[PDB]
Paper text:
We overcame this by exploiting a pepsin cleavage site (NGL|GCR) located in the linker connecting the SEMA and CR domains of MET, generating a receptor fragment containing the CR, Ig1 and Ig2 domains of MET, which contains MET residues 519–741. Crystals of the 107_A07 Fab – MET519–741 complex were obtained and diffracted to a maximum resolution of 2.6 Å at the European Synchrotron Radiation Facility (Beamline ID29, ESRF, Grenoble, France). The asymmetric unit contained two 107_A07 - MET519–741 complexes that, when superposed on their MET-Ig1 domains, showed close alignment of the MET chain and VH and VL domains but approximately 60° rotation of the CH1 and CL domains. The VH and VL domains of 107_A07 bind the Ig1 domain of MET and bury 555 Å2 and 243 Å2 respectively. The VH domain binds a discontinuous epitope including the tip of the β-hairpin (R592, N593 and K595), residues connecting the β-hairpin and the β-strand C (K599 and K600) and the tip of β-strand C (R602) and involves an extensive network of polar contacts and salt bridges involving CDRs 1, 2 and 3 of the antibody heavy chain. In contrast, the VL domain binds a linear epitope (L612, T613, L614, S615 and E616, a sequence corresponding to β-strand D of canonical E set domains) and makes limited contacts with MET predominantly via L3. The interactions of the VH domain with MET clarify the impact of the Y105W mutation that was found in each of the top 8 affinity matured clones. From the structure it is clear that the indole group of tryptophan creates an additional sidewall for the pocket formed by residues 99–105 of the heavy chain. Although extensive movements of the SEMA domain relative to the CR domain are enabled by the SEMA-CR domain linker, the structure of the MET CR-Ig1-Ig2 section reported here is rigid, due to extensive interactions between the top of Ig1 (notably the β-hairpin structure) and the CR domain, in addition to a second set of interactions between Ig1 and Ig2. In contrast, 107_A07 binds an epitope on the Ig1 domain of MET that overlaps with the primary binding site of InlB, yet 107_A07 also competes with HGF/SF and NK1 for MET binding.
An N-terminal semaphorin homology domain (SEMA), which binds the ligand HGF/SF, is followed by a “stalk” comprising one cysteine rich (CR) domain and 4 immunoglobulin domains termed Ig1-Ig428. HGF/SF-mediated activation of MET causes cell proliferation, cell migration, and angiogenesis, all of which contribute to cancer progression. Here, we report the isolation of a new human, phage-derived monoclonal antibody to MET (107_A07) displaying potent receptor antagonistic activity, and we describe the activity of 107_A07 on cancer cells in vitro and in in vivo. We also report a crystal structure of the 107_A07 Fab in complex with a MET receptor fragment containing amino acids 519–740, which includes the CR, Ig1 and Ig2 domains but not the ligand-binding SEMA domain.
Residue numbers in the entry:
A (entry chain H), F (entry chain S): 1 to 134, 140 to 221
B (entry chain L), G (entry chain T): 1 to 212
C (entry chain Y): 23 to 32
D (entry chain P), E (entry chain A): 519 to 740
H (entry chain X): 23 to 31
Write the structure that this text describes.
């Protein structure tokens, strides 16, 4: 089977260039065109452009014209996608894809994708805040706020508490810092006799927090 | 310029159902159309070439048909791995365009959310900011509206929703709205309500508190 | 049952 | 309309838009099915005839099993990949290129013992069906007559013995030339002797599938 | 045999065992090629007609470029993926589903000024071919007659101007209702006015592909 | 595309059992049969048997009857192949393959193969030696010596270098150890301004070395 | 029991040629036949299903034909990357059987090797053994002879060759000879030559060095 | 030139 092996995730400041690679194996690189495709978070697929590895010809979509440069190295069976002058908007997974043998254009083979996040923020540990309860069952949690970059891991009582846990997906704020929440349901009488600690962990900045959540 | 329009954008189905997904093109593209499947966290894979031809390896439970401007992707004998997002794409002319996508999801009995409200912590307040969290717990279907009203004033532009993927045990969703404010605006006001409308609720449910 | 008849000819 | 299809296999092979299923004995839509037996996946196997009835111990005989629903609908597509043919404790290997849903083709292996009234079992994934009538015989030539004839050939040669009508095809020969059949039976094989270009002797060789049998020498007189 | 095939594209489309190639102006095997040009891969493009001859500056006009060998044999299989159509320095976007090896269809882009004798360049991977007969015109309505008519409609409305017969299709309309065409030309567009239910004046709007043109008001008297 | 990832190379004693794994990803494991295929060195492909992951049914070839046991773990989407009573002849690369959707049998997707050597000799890590160069073009490389069994993998500059790379097949010495070489051509114009590392890697006994090469 | 017979077992052909590989089957298998391509060190991949149908991705330079008992695999316009072993396989009945394989090699213009010699490292020497490696670079055809000359004395029995598989881009071979000796025997001598005979060379090319 | 005739009509 064919392998479109793309390069790893990127974290560029706004205005910086980025170059995503796509090494191929399993077929002859020069036989087929190579598409690149953008997918913004929570959004659909969107064609960026293509290149013909045999002669170097390119065809861009009007939307990425001038800003994107697709190239192809036949010496190393690799296709590149460079995006000069990144904007905040440009945060997306970028796929490379081999063009189909069909008469019409299509994406026969796909790479695993490459997350290019774009943010002015620097590395920063999260700020963990308690979510205290205020029925028969009651809820509690932990606001995990203003951290960069992703990800953060969250457990309850060192992974003892698992059922009923809901750690929501991170939301990129206007400041360029991520923010997250993690909640859990517990018996209402168990509030003064059971302790509940959220174990936040942020490996990118070696930040760990164990806020205990109490009612009040 | 050629615009691909899928419908519905999402649908609910039990395992074993015959699902049908439609795809409109703004111009006649003959049978130059491809269907793809994208599960979350992964790259899309080809399902169908030439509007009707299965890709090598794709189960015969899938079948495409249609020509010109109207196309369908039927999924007989729905299987757990078939829950995913499906995209159509025309390759007739530049620019190449994809459809908006159809999310097939697991059908479940209706379930009303358990609403909880969370006042800002005193430790957050000493930092100069404030966050009021609204939790919607274990509900179905996915469609729910959440509305903040500080002292009976409908807020806008200062809250963020966040939804979990459908649960692997009870197939429910959970939502978290978050009202962000400066400490100056939090102390200026009294009542912090959180209205929640859902199909499981006969009327919108509101949870609230007062500072202090 | 044609196909059996046709099979057993060959 | 949807009631065109008559067999369970053809019914589930029907195009998806017709939305057909099998209701015990009819291809019909589910809204009009009157037993709780409607299905789009399950098809039980059934045999009604098997020829040849017997094979020489050496095997190599290809059976022809006529019936219904021998296949298995995998991923909403029928094939014979799940189909298994058991002749007792050994299995007959299917030839897919000559097999279908209604008739199967398979070569039996060799046996060393005579066995009579053996059972043919066929499983299609959902179920099994049996046929208790197959035998491993051991063909024998007791005599030939006449033992001589003209070099022109055309002598009506009578081979005599037992189990001479199993299984697929009989091929008598003399001098490597074909001894064309006149009549076949369990006990007697009549054939016309081939023309040799020399007056000489040959053993009469009978070929039954993978079984080989020699018998009396046949002299070609001038 | 090999000269059954008439075009270079058809010639290289012949099955491999036939061993056909293209020898400038003939499909023939290599042993009978008398120029040093025999090939099984190369096919140079050629245009002989382009319709319509002109488009309004707003563009949107779909061209039809008839000719030969517009494709490119990649991996021993022709398609139009390597085909490029340049209207001057801008490109007309191909419709693959309505295009073939010998005829192309493509929508022209916008122009800013009139242009006459515009060059259509087509590259097929192996070579390019040119066609200087196209124009970007700027249709204009100089006047309309008569200036008024009955609410019943049916008035013979004469539009007057220039370049009114360029592009794919004309659509005159007044009051939001269609003004059905009688005759089309460079200078005159005749049409019968639609029946209105209101007594008021309306501008006569002309639509040529993506181009829009307004003119004098037309009163519907009661 | 689908991934059939097989387990790494094995070195079993004669008479010993061996077990090759085959994890799949990209499709539903139970949908198709899984073939296993043997390939002795310089020899042809040979079908061993198959399994149906849905119910666990198996069909073995006559040659491998009784000696092979094919199984399928649906809990982890992986297929196993155990071959009891290894003989000297059984040394071969073993492939796993998904059965085709065609009506007849065929091998649709393939794993990368697993070299199972059968020898009484024990495993030994490689010994890495530099091969240093001395306005044209010049050569440099990495000698990988005295290891058992095969294979050993070699890269240059973490897989950055592809052009001019030449990794020769191992040669069995009079002693039971293999010996191998890996060279690359570079401009005389290069050093001393670029660095060149062979990243020698020997998985069968977990031995790795990255010596730098230059003449000084 | 079904026996697949391929022909030829190997062949050489120049770029752009029509290569043809036939495959006889002992029994009638209709069109239940697959062709495979195997590059060295890699698993085979399907080229053709049903004797004539290309697998998704395979160049149209490939074409299969035949039915019943005889099959062919044509490779029009031979390219350097076509260097591989090709297998036919019947899937009509158990056991599944493959053909013996056809090893295809690309013929190219003759090319003389670039000889390079590599003295043993001193880190190798304090271990007590020594190896002098001789590199022959990108040559065609594959046949190359290498002869050692220690102080002008023809060596034998203490060296092993190793040839790379044909390159898939420039269709060249590369050879690596290695003269192993004890360190004690390495000190005894001064000049270490490496004679290289090849079709591309008008005369044998020799590479050598002296210690220090 | 047959096909160009039918092509745009
Ligand atoms: C087969 O079984 C029947 C029992 O009904 C018996 O009468 C018959 O003799 C058997 N066949 C042979 C060849 O013995
Ligand atoms: C276009 O070309 C024709 C003949 O080549 C010429 O008569 C005409 O004047 C040209 N158009 C111009 C110059 O605008």
């Amino acid at each position: 089977q064919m392998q479109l092996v793309q390069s790893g995730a990127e974290v560029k400041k706004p205005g910086a260039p980025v170059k995503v690679s796509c090494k191929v194996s399993g077929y002859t690189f020069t036989d087929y065109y190579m598409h690149w495709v953008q997918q913004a978070p929570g959004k659909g697929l969107e064609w960026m452009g293509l290149v013909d590895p045999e002669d170097g010809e390119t065809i861009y979509a009007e939307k990425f014209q001038g800003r994107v440069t697709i190239t192809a190295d036949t010496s190393t069976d690799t296709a590149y996608m460079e995006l000069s002058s990144l904007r905040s908007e440009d945060t997306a997974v970028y796929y490379c894809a081999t063009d189909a043998t069909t008469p019409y254009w299509g994406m026969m083979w796909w790479g695993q994708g490459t997350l290019v996040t774009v943010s002015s923020a620097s590395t920063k540990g999260p700020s963990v805040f308690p979510l205290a309860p205020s029925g028969g069952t009651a809820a509690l949690g932990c606001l995990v706020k203003d951290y960069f970059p992703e990800p953060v891991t969250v457990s309850w009582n060192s992974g003892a508490l698992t059922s009923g846990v809901h750690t929501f997906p991170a939301v990129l704020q206007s400041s360029g810092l991520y923010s997250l929440s993690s909640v859990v349901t517990v018996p209402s009488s168990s509030l003064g006799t059971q302790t509940y600690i959220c174990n936040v962990n942020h490996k990118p900045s070696n930040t760990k927090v164990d806020k205990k959540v109490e009612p009040k | 310029d050629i615009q691909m329009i899928q419908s519905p954008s999402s649908l609910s189905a039990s395992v074993g159902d015959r699902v049908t997904i439609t795809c409109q093109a703004s111009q006649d593209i003959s049978n130059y159309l491809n269907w793809y499947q994208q599960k979350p966290g992964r790259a899309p894979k080809v399902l169908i070439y030439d509007a009707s031809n299965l890709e090598t390896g794709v189960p015969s439970r899938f079948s495409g048909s249609g020509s010109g401007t109207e196309f369908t992707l039927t999924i007989s004998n729905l299987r757990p791995d078939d829950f995913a997002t499906y995209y159509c794409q025309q390759g007739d002319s530049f620019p190449l365009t994809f459809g908006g996508g159809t999310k097939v999801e697991i059908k479940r009995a209706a379930a009303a959310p358990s609403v909880f409200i969370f006042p800002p912590s005193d430790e957050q307040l000493k930092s100069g900011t404030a966050s009021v969290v609204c939790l919607l717990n274990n509900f179905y279907p996915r469609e729910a509206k959440v509305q903040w009203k500080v002292d009976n004033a409908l807020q806008s532009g200062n809250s963020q929703e966040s939804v979990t993927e459908q649960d692997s045990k009870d197939s429910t969703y959970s939502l978290s709205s978050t009202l962000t404010l400066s400490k100056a605006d939090y102390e200026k006001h009294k009542l912090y309500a959180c209205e929640v409308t859902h199909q499981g609720l006969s009327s919108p449910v509101t949870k609230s508190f007062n500072r202090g | 049952t044609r196909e059996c008849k046709e099979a057993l000819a060959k | 309309g949807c009631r065109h299809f008559q067999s369970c296999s053809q019914c589930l092979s029907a195009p998806p838009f017709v939305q057909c299923g099998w209701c015990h004995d009819k291809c019909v839509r589910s809204e009009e099915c009157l037993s709780g037996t409607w299905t789009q996946q399950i098809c039980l196997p059934a045999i009604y005839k098997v020829f040849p009835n017997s094979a020489p111990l050496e095997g190599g005989t290809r059976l022809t099993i006529c019936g219904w629903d021998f296949g298995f609908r995998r991923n909403n597509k029928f094939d014979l990949k799940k189909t298994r043919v058991l002749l007792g404790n050994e299995s007959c290997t299917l030839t897919l290129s000559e097999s279908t849903m209604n008739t199967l083709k398979c070569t039996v292996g060799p046996a060393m013992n005579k066995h009579f009234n053996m059972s043919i079992i066929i499983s299609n994934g959902h179920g099994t069906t049996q046929y208790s009538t197959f035998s491993y015989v051991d063909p024998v030539i007791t005599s030939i007559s006449p033992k001589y004839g003209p070099m022109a050939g055309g002598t009506l040669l009578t081979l005599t013995g037992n189990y001479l009508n199993s299984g697929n095809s009989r091929h008598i020969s003399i001098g490597g030339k074909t001894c064309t059949l006149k009549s076949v039976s369990n006990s007697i094989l009549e054939c016309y002797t081939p023309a040799q270009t020399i007056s000489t002797e040959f053993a009469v060789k009978l070929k039954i599938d993978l079984a080989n049998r020699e018998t009396s020498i046949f002299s070609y007189r001038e």
